[PDB]
Design an enzyme around this catalytic site. Structure first.
Site, PDB file in Angstrom:
ATOM      1  N   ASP A  60      13.059  -6.175  -4.783  1.00  0.00           N
ATOM      2  CA  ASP A  60      13.997  -5.608  -5.704  1.00  0.00           C
ATOM      3  C   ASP A  60      14.832  -6.722  -6.293  1.00  0.00           C
ATOM      4  OD1 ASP A  60      13.441  -3.176  -3.702  1.00  0.00           O
ATOM      5  OD2 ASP A  60      14.318  -2.306  -5.483  1.00  0.00           O
ATOM      6  N   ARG A 104       0.834  -1.200   0.000  1.00  0.00           N
ATOM      7  CA  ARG A 104       0.000   0.000   0.000  1.00  0.00           C
ATOM      8  C   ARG A 104       0.872   1.255   0.000  1.00  0.00           C
ATOM      9  NH1 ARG A 104      -0.637   3.113   3.012  1.00  0.00           N
ATOM     10  NH2 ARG A 104       0.716   3.399   4.850  1.00  0.00           N
ATOM     11  N   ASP A 152       8.735  -3.970  -0.340  1.00  0.00           N
ATOM     12  CA  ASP A 152       9.514  -3.791  -1.564  1.00  0.00           C
ATOM     13  C   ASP A 152      10.205  -5.083  -1.993  1.00  0.00           C
ATOM     14  OD1 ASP A 152       8.890  -1.059  -1.738  1.00  0.00           O
ATOM     15  OD2 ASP A 152      10.489  -0.620  -0.303  1.00  0.00           O
TER      16      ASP A 152
END
Ligand SMILES: CC1(C)Nc2nc(N)[nH]c(=O)c2N=C1CNCCN1CCC(SC[C@H]2O[C@@H](n3cnc4c(N)ncnc43)[C@H](O)[C@@H]2O)CC1
Length: 154
Positions: free
Chosen positions: A93, A82, A91
């Site tokens: 990556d 959110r 996150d």
């Protein structure tokens, strides 16, 4: 192919979020988890008045194309997520995608700033201490050159 993925979250209590993200990663088609680092508690890179982050790294074996993996990691972020300097719900990556070099609009691999982030490098070094980058740099050599502070476990 072995992809290395960095995970971060600083929900006040991020354990459940990270465990959910990990389950989702393991559920990605044509892919499975090889190794997960320890969970690390790191101070915010950003305004010091948000919670500590939980950072980890994952080695994921996969047959997907790089941009297909990114599609899944983005999907997972949307489904459990959110902002700019945090807080961050979740996150994901892509640090490395096998030995591939990618520089597109959507994807830069190796990850465009991991060289400067001990919270990315130290967990990776835990699960892959011998790692060599596509350009021949060694992860161990980067940590040894920069002397980033070691991380505390969650
Ligand atoms: C606030 C901050 C700086 N402070 C932190 N302090 C600690 N202590 N710990 C942390 O953890 C931590 N984290 C952050 C924020 N990290 C988000 C990194 N991330 C940005 C890129 C994308 S979000 C933008 C865009 O990046 C594009 N992208 C290009 N290359 C890649 C790639 N290799 N992997 C994924 N996305 C890629 C992608 O298309 C996306 O639309 C996904 C998430």
């Amino acid at each position: 192919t072995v992809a290395y993925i960095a995970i971060g979250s600083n929900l006040a209590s991020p354990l459940e979020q990270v465990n959910a993200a990990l389950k989702a990663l393991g559920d990605i088609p044509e892919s499975h988890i090889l190794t997960v680092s320890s969970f690390y508690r790191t101070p915010p890179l950003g305004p010091q008045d948000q919670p500590d982050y939980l950072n980890a790294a994952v080695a994921l074996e996969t047959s997907l194309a790089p941009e297909e993996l990114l599609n899944h990691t983005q999907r997972i972020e949307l489904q459990q997520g959110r902002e700019r300097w945090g807080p961050r719900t979740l996150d994901l990556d892509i640090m490395l995608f096998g030995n591939e070099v990618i520089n597109t609009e959507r994807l830069t691999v190796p990850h465009y700033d991991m060289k400067n982030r001990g919270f990315m490098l130290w967990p990776l070094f835990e699960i892959a201490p011998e790692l060599v980058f596509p350009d021949g740099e060694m992860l161990r050599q980067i940590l040894h050159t920069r002397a980033f502070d070691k991380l505390n476990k969650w």
